[PDB]
């Protein structure tokens, strides 16, 4: 069997301003690898993860299940503006080692005040569109 070895997941969160959430928003599960056997999701802390990131939105890629032991993968997160352009990109500098149940991401992905300022056009109609591009280098 062949494998989906790179993939891009687009996720829109409606009414983001009214996200009454350390509380997590979880995306749908999406699949990768051979026979859809690698399962992933995105997880968002809209008000931060811990106290040191209260001013930020945190965003993580989580490996939900995998057939073997480890998966090594590079990943990139970005926000799509109204024009569909990628902006505020952050990417792993290297492949990270994932095992079933483990996440990797950015506690300080983006400042809340920057995200909430309408002049930056990142919440058109109160909608946050995240973009996650993954490249699996092993498994």
């Amino acid at each position: 069997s062949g494998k989906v070895v790179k993939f891009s997941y687009m996720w829109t969160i409606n009414n983001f301003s009214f996200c009454r959430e350390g509380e997590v928003i979880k995306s749908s599960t999406f699949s990768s690898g051979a026979n859809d056997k690698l399962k992933w999701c995105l997880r968002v802390n809209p008000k931060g993860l811990d106290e040191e990131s209260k001013d930020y939105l945190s965003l993580y890629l989580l490996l939900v299940s995998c057939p073997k032991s480890e998966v090594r993968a590079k990943f990139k997160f970005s926000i799509l503006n109204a024009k569909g352009e990628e902006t505020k990109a952050m990417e792993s500098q290297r492949a990270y080692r994932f095992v079933q149940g483990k996440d990797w991401g950015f506690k300080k992905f983006i400042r809340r005040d920057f995200l909430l300022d309408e002049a930056n056009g990142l919440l058109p109609d109160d909608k946050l569109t995240l973009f996650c591009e993954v490249s699996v280098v092993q498994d």
């Binding site: 993860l49 993580y60 792993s92 500098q93 990270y96 149940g101 483990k102 996440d103 990797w104 991401g105 950015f106 506690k107």
Partner: peptide, 7 residues
């Protein structure tokens, strides 16, 4: 650098 929330 990326961070993880799980031990």
């Amino acid at each position: 650098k990326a961070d993880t929330t799980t031990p």
